[PDB]
C-alpha cells in the first residue's frame, strides 16, 4: 500500500477532485423522497466530477464506546446503494463518507477516552471496536458498490493520537476495500496527524477565514511537501450569512441573517490561492442537501448550499476553467 505522490495503481497521478458533498445529515426518509433524485441531478450543474455521499452514525456522548448506524432515522444500506448508483449514473466518481455524530450535540472532535485503561471507564479498545464495526460495514458497502474512494473519518481530533489503533483499523479496511483511502483531518490540523503515511491521500476541512487563504496555502504546501502525498480539501464551504466568512466552519453563526456576497467572496478567495498547484488535488465542497430548496427561495436561504446563489457561479467558472479542467 505505501506510496508517495501517486496511490499504487491497484487502488485507482491521483484525480483532481471537483466535488460537492451530497445527502448530509443522512436521513432515510429524505434520501427515499422523489426530491432526492432531483436534488442530485441539479447538483451536476456545478460541473463537478465527484461527490461525497455523506451520512451520520451516532454515539450517545463524546465518552461512550457504542456507535449505532443504519437504524432509523439514519440511512439504510439500500438508501446508500441508491445514492452511490445514482451518482455514478450521472457520471460522478464517489467518495463514501460515514461520519460519527454525538446524540447530545457534542462536536465529534471531542470524542475521547483516558490514555490509561482503567476498570471504571470505557476504553479506547472498546470505542475502536465499535468504530471498526461502523467503518468496516461501510468499507464493505464501498467495495460492493465500486466507490472510488472511502473517507475513514472526519475531524476525529481527540482520537488521532491513537496511532496504533488507527493503523490497525486502516489494515482491516485494506482487507475489505481496494479503492483509495483518505482521512479528513480538521481545519488547522494538517501537520498534527502522525499516520498520514497509512492512507493514500491526505485531506482536511478548508474552512479558513476570508483574508487567511494566502497564509494557509503557504502553510499547507510545506506540510504536504514534507509528507510527499497527494492532498485535497475533503470539505470546504461557507454559509450565505452576515460575517460567516470570518468563521466559515460555524454552522450556528448569525442564523437567518442572509449575505449572498459573503459566501461569494469566500469562494473567490479560496480559488485564488488554491487552484492548479501540482501538489494539490482540489475540492470536495460542503454541501448539498438530499431535499433541495426551491430556486425561488435561494436568496433567503442561510445554508452552506450554493444552489441559486452567486457562489455557485464562482464554483462553475472554476471547475469548467481550462487550467482546472485539464488537471
Ligand X SMILES: OC[C@H]1O[C@@H](O[C@H]2[C@H](O)[C@H](O)[C@H](O[C@H]3[C@H](O)[C@H](O)[C@@H](O)O[C@@H]3CO)O[C@@H]2CO)[C@@H](O)[C@@H](O)[C@@H]1O
Summarize as ranges the residues that interact with a copy of itself (CB under 8 A).
Answer: 61-63, 104, 106-107, 109-110, 112, 114-116, 118-121, 157-158, 161, 187-189, 192, 207, 247, 249
Q: Which parts of 86-230 are beta strand (E)?
A: 93-102, 149-154, 180-185, 201-206
H helices within 154-244, ranges in order? 163-176, 213-227
Instruction: Give the residue with the Cβ less far from ligand X, 103 or 172.
Output: 103
Q: Provide the binding-site residues for ligand X, judged by CB under 6 A.
A: 24-25, 99, 101, 154-155, 205, 235, 249, 251, 286-287
Partner interacting with residue 296 (select from ligand X, a copy of itself, none; CB below 5-8 Å by kind): none
Q: How far is the CB of 120 from a copy of itself (least distance, A)?
A: 6
Partner interacting with residue 286 (select from ligand X, a copy of itself, none; CB below 5-8 Å by kind): ligand X
Partner interacting with residue 63 (select from a copy of itself, ligand X, none; CB below 5-8 Å by kind): a copy of itself
Q: How far is the CB of 101 from ligand X (least distance, A)?
A: 5
Burial status of residue 2 (CB atoms within 10 A of its CB: 0-12, 13-18, 19 or more): exposed
End-to-end CA distance of the chain: 24
CB 53 within 8 A of CB 23: yes
CB 141 within 8 A of CB 179: no
Using alpha carbons only, how large is the chain's radius of gyration in Å? 19
Instruction: Give the residue with the Cβ less far from ligand X, 24 or 82.
Output: 24
CB 150 within 8 A of CB 177: yes
Gaps in the chain (C–N > 2.5 Å) come after which residues?
Answer: 12
CB 279 within 8 A of CB 9: no
Looking at residue 160, the DSSP 8-state letter turns out to be T
Partner interacting with residue 161 (select from ligand X, a copy of itself, none; CB below 5-8 Å by kind): a copy of itself
Distance CA 237, CA 105 (A): 21
Q: How far is the CB of 24 from ligand X (least distance, A)?
A: 5
Amino acid at each position: 500500500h505505501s506510496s508517495g505522490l501517486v496511490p499504487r495503481g491497484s487502488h485507482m497521478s491521483m484525480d483532481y477532485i471537483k466535488g460537492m458533498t451530497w445527502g448530509w445529515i443522512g436521513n432515510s426518509e429524505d434520501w427515499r423522497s422523489n426530491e432526492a433524485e432531483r436534488s442530485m441531478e441539479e447538483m451536476t450543474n456545478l460541473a463537478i466530477n465527484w461527490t461525497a455521499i455523506a451520512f451520520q452514525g451516532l454515539q450517545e456522548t463524546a465518552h461512550s464506546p457504542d456507535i449505532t448506524f443504519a437504524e432509523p432515522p439514519m440511512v439504510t444500506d439500500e438508501n446508500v446503494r441508491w445514492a452511490i448508483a445514482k451518482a455514478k449514473s450521472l457520471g460522478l466518481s464517489v467518495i463514501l463518507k460515514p461520519i460519527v455524530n454525538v446524540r447530545d450535540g457534542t462536536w465529534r472532535a471531542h470524542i475521547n477516552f483516558f490514555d490509561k485503561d482503567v476498570p471504571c471507564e470505557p476504553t479506547w479498545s472498546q470505542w475502536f471496536k465499535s468504530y471498526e464495526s461502523f467503518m468496516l460495514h461501510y468499507a464493505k458497502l464501498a467495495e460492493d458498490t465500486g466507490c472510488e474512494m472511502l473517507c475513514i473519518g472526519c475531524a476525529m481530533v481527540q482520537t488521532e493520537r491513537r496511532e496504533k489503533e488507527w493503523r490497525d483499523l486502516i489494515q482491516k479496511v485494506r482487507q475489505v476495500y481496494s479503492g483509495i483511502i483518505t482521512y479528513n483531518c480538521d481545519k488547522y490540523q494538517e501537520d498534527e496527524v502522525t499516520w498520514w503515511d497509512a492512507v493514500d491521500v491526505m485531506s482536511s476541512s478548508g474552512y479558513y477565514p476570508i483574508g487567511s487563504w494566502e497564509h494557509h496555502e503557504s502553510r499547507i504546501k510545506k506540510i504536504v511537501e514534507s509528507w510527499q502525498k497527494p492532498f485535497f480539501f475533503m470539505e470546504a464551504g461557507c454559509p450565505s450569512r452576515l460575517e460567516s466568512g470570518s468563521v466559515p466552519y460555524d454552522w450556528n453563526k448569525n442564523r437567518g441573517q442572509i449575505d449572498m456576497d459573503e459566501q461569494r467572496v469566500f469562494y473567490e478567495e479560496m480559488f485564488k490561492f488554491f487552484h492548479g498547484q501540482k501538489w494539490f488535488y482540489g475540492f470536495m465542497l460542503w454541501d448539498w442537501p438530499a431535499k433541495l430548496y426551491r430556486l425561488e427561495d435561494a436568496s433567503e436561504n442561510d445554508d452552506y448550499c450554493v444552489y441559486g446563489k452567486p457562489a455557485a457561479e464562482v464554483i462553475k467558472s472554476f471547475f469548467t476553467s481550462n487550467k482546472i479542467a485539464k488537471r
